[PDB]
Symmetry: C5
Subunit: 375 residues, 5 copies
């Protein structure tokens, strides 16, 4: 007798957890301000997440971003040949960049003055400089050191403790003098969006309109980027939450299912163990009150106006898909305020999340019911 009650309690808890997970998935409001963008050219790339003013942008990519890469002035026999003094036990390589707070220091050992060793140490630094070796032809090799993109990453190199390695790797970017040689010079990205000039370090421009991120593969002219509203994710989330509510109420009805029996007959095992439970009735009444919104500033106060209606017998909400789509498309802000609102007290999603959290909160009605049952 009590085992069936405990099993019903566990099933109800599992269903409530699933419904809470679905509602939490619905909670985030970035889906309502969802846009989709496209461009005429295949060079420019566009990505929009939220907060994008739907419209048309004439995006001109007047420039791309180049890193800085430097190379030695001397070719060598191979990689393993020594490029510095072997009598010196240790030495330091110092690289100064305007965009870093403190200079970069690399410690080099006694016999590790081979281009392979220098390259491995510098690539192990992992602070915006990367090393490579260039094989021009047979019996020729060069060392190449590269920065990241932007004029804030031009670099000035010096060596302390050694003199030959300082005769090799010393470069001064501020004075444009050094023992290395410049391969690739650093530049900034520059574009024009709807009459506003935008400058960036890299080629991933993110706040020309705040909310739209561009990618500059090639220089383009008068490329049209069109951004439109979108709610397919919004409607999919709405239907997912509706189906989760349907599953939850179906589980509640099954746990509260009662089968008519003849007088004097034995109790059927098909009967739900949650018949006449105060917690179930309280939770269902709270959710039903959540259905008819109060305190919202939206024009539509209920999804009955939106088009979602709950059948009494089945307990499953049925969606008027076309009318819901019309409501979402015509007035986005009204639906968003109805479901989200300020996010603290108003908004159907917000209030339902708060109510379900309170129901599942510690020392709540569920915890008290469990304590009473286990007592």
């Amino acid at each position: 007798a009590n085992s069936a009650k405990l099993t019903a309690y566990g099933t109800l808890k599992s269903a409530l957890e699933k419904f809470q997970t679905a509602n939490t998935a619905l909670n985030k409001a970035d889906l309502f301000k969802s846009t989709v963008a496209s461009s005429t050219t295949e060079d420019l790339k566009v990505s929009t997440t939220a907060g994008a003013c739907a419209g048309t942008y004439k995006i001109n990519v007047t420039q791309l971003a180049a890193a800085q890469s430097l190379a030695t002035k001397t070719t060598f026999a191979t990689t393993k040949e020594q490029l510095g003094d072997t009598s010196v036990t240790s030495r330091t390589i110092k690289i100064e960049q305007p965009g870093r707070k403190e200079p970069l220091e690399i410690k080099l050992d006694k016999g590790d003055t081979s281009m392979e060793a220098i390259r491995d140490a510098i690539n192990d630094a992992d602070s915006g400089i990367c090393a490579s070796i260039v094989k021009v032809k047979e019996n020729e090799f060069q060392l190449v050191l590269t920065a990241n993109s932007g004029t804030d990453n031009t670099m000035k190199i010096t060596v302390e403790g050694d003199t030959k390695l300082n005769d090799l790797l010393a470069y001064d970017s501020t004075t444009n003098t050094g023992n290395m040689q410049e391969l690739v010079k650093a530049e900034n990205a520059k574009l024009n969006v709807n009459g506003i000039d935008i400058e960036r370090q890299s080629n991933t421009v993110t706040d020309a309109p705040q909310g739209i991120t561009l990618t500059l593969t090639k220089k383009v002219t008068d490329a049209t980027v069109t951004v439109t509203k979108d709610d397919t994710k919004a409607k999919e989330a709405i239907k997912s939450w509706v189906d989760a509510y349907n599953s939850l109420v179906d589980t509640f009805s099954s746990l509260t299912k009662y089968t008519a029996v003849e007088p004097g007959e034995e109790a059927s095992d098909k009967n739900g163990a949650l018949l006449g439970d105060s917690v179930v009735r309280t939770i269902q009444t709270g959710i039903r009150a959540q259905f008819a919104n109060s305190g919202s500033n939206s024009a539509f106060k209920t999804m009955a106006e939106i088009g979602i209606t709950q059948d009494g017998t089945s307990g499953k909400l049925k969606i008027d898909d076309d009318k819901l789509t019309k409501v979402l498309k015509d007035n986005t802000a009204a639906a968003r305020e109805l479901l989200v609102g300020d996010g603290k007290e108003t908004g159907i999603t917000t209030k339902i999340a708060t109510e379900v959290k309170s129901y599942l909160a510690d020392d709540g009605i569920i915890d008290n019911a469990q304590d009473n049952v286990n007592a």
Copy 2:
């Protein structure tokens, strides 16, 4: 004995409901005036639903539609900095557009003069103006307000209650004066179709020929849009309705199936419980008479001329696909009048829909039979 009769009644009701659903799906008549269109270029897009004169249109997209977007004249330190007086408790922002009946008013609070707050309020208005923030570079920000497409949506902005915010957001489009600056100027879409000039607000042109909707991604010249008649949807609907009628008559024959038995033997359960019933015979006779169309203006006076013939033993219709396709292709209006007609009195589909609805209507022969049986 009576339980079998009730089961047969329920099965007949379900079969008739399915047939009525299929017939109602068939009832929609725009499928006969179905066309399909295509263009030479991939810039112009075309969509045709109904009422399109099949032919060739030389469509020149001489212009596209631009919205209006405005921006402030001052750059600021960040978003959260205040842009208006803090001693003022509340204020009003008024936007006047020719295409709206009443002006747009936005209420701004005391400490909410930050570009984020203004942007959120204006995007919450949801009346054809959208707000965004532009990050030119580090320690630079702009506010951008955008309209919709068309010269009917140019806007004039003023502020009541505050003076700094009025020194910021006030624009006058009629006089081309203001405190903001124009980024994108509004224009109308203009195209030429078969020698007729068409002007629109947006870039979705819908009534150049009434029934064909164009989409203007790029300016195109002498693009050929060819529109041809189509009946694949029509023939698919015809086959679907015929197969639904086949299923209906198969269910009827099963419910009226009589198996030969030796005299004096018990009643077989395989025998349909609907044997010798007036309702079934009356409905079948009515449908059969509906097949023999009367009063239609079409040249073909019967659906048998089309090519679909009903087998006597099975009762399920078989379609001569080639002859039906020939009839549909050669004379579309004749077939449409034969099946649809004026939509009130004549037409095979219209007569059949009316008859089946009357059979399934409340207080009809089926409801009377149910009342008699349940009594």
Copy 3:
């Protein structure tokens, strides 16, 4: 005992029906003269069915076909506004075309002088004229009437019974005068194929070489259309006929299968009930004799030369696919005459079809056997 005989007779009848159906599918000889075509450009489209001289055609599409479409000289307030006298009870619209035997007459009612009503009536005519409405802008509407393609479809319009509608819709194409206005003027399609000029009405040219149908989407110059022989359909049909014969012979062998048993044992049910039957032996002997052709003018007299040989024990044909492909590719007309010939007495497919039909014909040996068994 006799039940097994009847079952075997029915199985043989079904197998013979299937073989006859497959042979009838094989009978048609258009597959032997099968070609496949292609073009260099994607504007021109090509379709070849039969009787096409394989080769190369330099096809120049010097012109396309334009229909004729006319429009009114006056714009109106809307569709529902009346266009003619309301006191007149009925009136007639007459359209004369050179390509039609009798003029087109449309009857218009008393209060049905709205552009919607005229448009619906003319589209209901369904005689090569279609009606549409054009919305230039707000509070502007036009009526447009369109013909089909070709100079044989230019039309002359008049109205009898009414004077205002005659002031609206009257056009004279012969004199180029009227109350309507010309939008699209009619032209003929003109192309050049292998030095021969071809003229057509529409843009579907079908007899430049008799057997090849072109489609003219855009004007093209020196497009090369290459047409080659093809027998993949012929090969697949040959395989299908061979497999059908294999199935038929397997069914015959099963119905004539005899299982060795010890003397004095009972008759096995595995034994075919068609053992020692005159009709079955006669049919099999006829098929075996017609396997090798007599009276054919082809160099090869049997498919044993071609490569298809019947196994002794199983009786199912096995195909030497490589040798059959070689025979088909090297000599097409020889194999065609060998299978088809004149189509009356010679040709293996034709005379086999005749023999099988005579076997299955009414009052034939099969029907006589059925009558004798049922007697």
Copy 4:
């Protein structure tokens, strides 16, 4: 007892037949000289089978091949109209071509002087001339006769027995005089491959390098066709043969499988019936001797050097795929000689095929064993 022995003999024979089939599939050596080609342009097409010198060919398609097609000088009313004398019972049409050994003769009947009849007869000739009918417009028709590609197929036509048909179809290509008229003039294909000029009749060039076949869809300039070595087919065949040998030895071990039993116990039915058989041991010893190649001129004497090693317990070969690929890629000729060689006495595949055919041939060890068993 003997039934199990016969079943084991049959299973061994089936396994040996399958292994022999796999070895015969492996036998052909064209897989070792396998190349793959590609081109820069999509006009030129390339196909390589064997014997192709891997490298780069600059192929210039300076010309394509045109057939010859002729047409009559008179247009007619239709096809069924007679084009020749009806009093003449029969007549001859003679076509002479330089590329044919004997002239082409067509016999025409009394009333068969219709363009349809002439066309059908000439298409029935099937000797490089094909007939077609051209419908210029209404009440106009032409007859067109076409050759194949190459200047060796220009044709000269005359008629014996009739005068009108000779006034119609007589053409002289040598003197460029006739009653027909030329539509398409015959030309030869000309291309340049790696500085060598190649001339052909058709547009399928096959021996510019002997082993590479080109296809000339359009005139191309400086198209680079690169041909590289390939062994994916070779390695796949090697794996297939190795797995076939694995299956064969697995079957042998199953038929020679022995299970240990306790003293005094009954013989296990899981034991193979081929335990201690002279034929099996002899065949396996011969195969293992073939594994250790002798007389080969290759640097490698065994696939153990290549990477394929035979496990003792399972008896199935295990392949070092990486090492086998290395061996195949580095030295193709060495592996080819090791497996194939001259194809008569040396080569592992050759010797294995000879040994297996000798084992499975009539009067062989298996046939002798079966004869002894039947004795």
Copy 5:
């Protein structure tokens, strides 16, 4: 009882072998230095394996590589005709190349002076020269000999023992004199990458930056090749190793599973036979200490900081995928040192590989346990 213990030992050994295989698969460290490259043009092809400096390279393909191919000066009747003296029993063909250590010698027999025989012998030599036959037209043939790509493979040919074959095949590349003729002249590949000129023999350039391999299909200008860091392989390997450890711990817990039973009851079969085993506890403690690694120079001293945490009850690791991705993306060298390090003494993967190898090493704790059990 002991059979269950042996089965548990075998299961533990199999699970540990699988975990060792997975950890050895993870042991390879070049996955951490994984990059992905792309180009703007479709001609140039790019591949990257490891050690690639992420950035942008402007690659100009100023030249491609051509092999050398030579041909005879005389055309012949066919292939089988003899091209040399028949009285000479044997002769030698000598080819000298700068890029080979010793000259190439081909031995030719008495009657084997046919172009087919010479071609087959030279293609059988397989030392960078390949032979082909060219059919210019009917009754014309040429022999063509081709080298490989690069000026180091120009070849000089002479014949010893014969005078006619030496009159045919003798070429001198150094002096540009000979009896053959040059078809294709040899050249070197030349490109420019980020201001560094690169020269190669073939068209597969591999060390312009050491780590990026280019393929030069066509001459390209200012092609941008962008190379970015990548860790999808890294994260997939990490997750695969984590799941392998999870499965290993699940197997361990199954072999150490203990089920609570009533006192005096029989031992459950579900209880693992490895309960209270020193080897299992030692291995698990060692591996758990390996996660809590010491001596690593990485900023994160524990893998738990990355985001992968082991549940006590289940023993299977749960991965914080987002935090793992952030850790890998932000600091690649730190994670690499944490897992790999120098590869000898530090690095979690290195420590775990050493520990598991020692556990599974011969004469180890597992081998000693097996020896004790089998004793």
